[PDB]
Ligand binder design. Structure first.
Ligand SMILES: CC(C)(CO)NC(=O)c1cccc(Cl)c1
Length: 291
C-alpha cells in the first residue's frame, strides 16, 4: 500500500489522553518557501477570485512524535506540534509542485516535510455495541478523494502547560466530528484511545492521528441516528457497517481499492493495535483462525 505509511503504532492497545504530552512551539512550524511565501498568497488570491465564499482557518501542524521506552511509567508519547492554516495547505501539500517542495526540503533542511503545511487530521475506528466498524461514502462532487469510502474525522482548529489543553482539544475534536457527521449523542461514546499516526503519501505526506472509539448503540441504532438528520445533517452520502471479524482481511477485499488513504490508516492501526491478540486465550486457533 504505497499511499499510506505508519509514523507511530501505540503500545498497550492504544494510549489514553492522560498518557500524552504535547509541545506546541514555533520551532515546529513550516519553514518559509525558498522563493518566499508570495507563491502561497498568489494561489490563495486565484482561488478566492473564483470562490469568494471560502475562508482560511488555523490548523495544528505535526512536526514529529516520540514514544517512550515500552513498559515505562509516566507519559508514554510526546507530540511536537506547530501551527499552520488551510491557506498554507492549499499552497503546499495540495499544490501541483508538492513533490518539488519535498526534494527542496531534503536538500536544504534534510527534511522532506520542511516546506509543507502538513495539517494534523483525526480519524476514528468507531465500533458499535454489536461489533461492527462504521464507514461513510464521500460525495462524487468534492475535490479530495471523490466517491471513496472514509471513516469519521476531520482537521481540528486551535482554540505541557498549554500542551495538556492541546491534547484535550485533539481527543475532544474526534468525539465532536463523530457527533457532527454520524449524529450520535456524546453520551453513547467512550473516551478515545490513540492507536497511532498514519501519513497520506497521495497528499505529500500529511499525517492523521487515528483513534479507537466504542459506541453503546447497535449498528441499526447508529444508522437510525445518521439518517434522521436528513441530507443536510451530513457531508457524506451514505453509512455502512463491516463486522470486526471481517475487518481483519479487509485489505484482501474489493472494498480496499475504494478506501481513501486516511481510512486505510485507521483500519491498518485497528488491526495491529486492537486486533492481533498476544495471549494464549484470544490467540487459540478456534478464536484466531489461521490464514
Ligand atoms: C473542502 C474542505 C473545506 C472540506 O472539509 N476541505 C478541508 O476542510 C480540508 C481538507 C484537507 C486538509 C485541510 Cl487542512 C482541510
Amino acid at each position: 500500500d504505497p499511499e499510506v505509511t505508519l509514523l507511530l503504532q501505540c503500545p498497550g492497545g492504544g494510549l489514553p489522553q492522560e498518557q500524552i504530552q504535547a509541545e506546541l512551539s514555533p520551532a515546529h512550524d513550516r519553514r518559509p518557501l525558498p522563493g518566499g511565501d508570495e507563491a502561497i498568497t498568489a494561489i490563495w488570491e486565484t482561488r478566492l477570485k473564483a470562490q469568494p465564499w471560502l475562508f482560511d482557518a488555523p490548523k495544528f501542524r505535526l512536526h514529529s512524535a516520540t514514544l517512550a521506552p515500552i513498559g515505562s511509567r509516566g507519559p508514554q508519547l510526546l507530540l511536537r506540534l506547530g501551527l499552520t492554516s488551510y491557506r498554507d495547505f492549499l499552497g503546499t501539500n495540495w499544490s501541483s509542485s508538492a513533490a518539488w517542495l519535498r526534494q527542496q526540503g531534503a536538500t536544504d533542511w534534510g527534511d522532506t516535510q520542511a516546506y509543507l503545511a502538513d495539517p494534523l487530521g483525526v480519524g476514528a475506528a468507531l465500533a458499535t455495541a454489536d461489533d461492527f466498524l462504521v464507514f461513510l461514502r464521500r460525495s462524487r462532487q468534492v475535490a479530495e478523494a471523490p466517491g471513496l469510502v472514509d471513516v469519521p474525522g476531520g482537521h481540528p482548529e486551535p482554540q505541557d502547560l498549554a500542551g495538556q489543553l492541546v491534547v484535550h482539544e485533539l481527543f475532544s475534536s474526534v468525539l465532536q466530528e463523530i457527533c457532527d457527521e454520524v449524529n450520535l449523542p456524546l453520551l453513547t461514546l467512550s473516551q478515545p484511545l490513540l492507536l497511532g499516526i498514519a501519513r497520506n503519501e497521495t497528499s505529500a505526506g500529511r499525517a492523521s492521528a487515528e483513534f479507537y472509539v466504542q459506541c453503546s448503540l447497535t449498528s441499526e441504532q447508529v444508522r437510525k441516528h445518521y439518517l434522521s438528520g436528513g441530507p443536510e445533517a451530513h457531508e457524506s452520502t451514505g453509512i455502512f457497517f463491516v463486522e470486526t471479524q471481517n475487518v481483519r482481511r479487509l485489505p484482501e477485499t474489493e472494498m480496499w481499492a475504494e478506501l481513501c488513504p486516511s481510512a486505510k490508516g485507521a483500519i491498518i492501526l485497528y488491526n495491529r493495535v486492537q486486533g492481533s491478540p498476544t495471549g494464549a486465550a484470544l490467540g487459540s486457533p478456534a478464536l484466531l483462525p489461521p490464514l
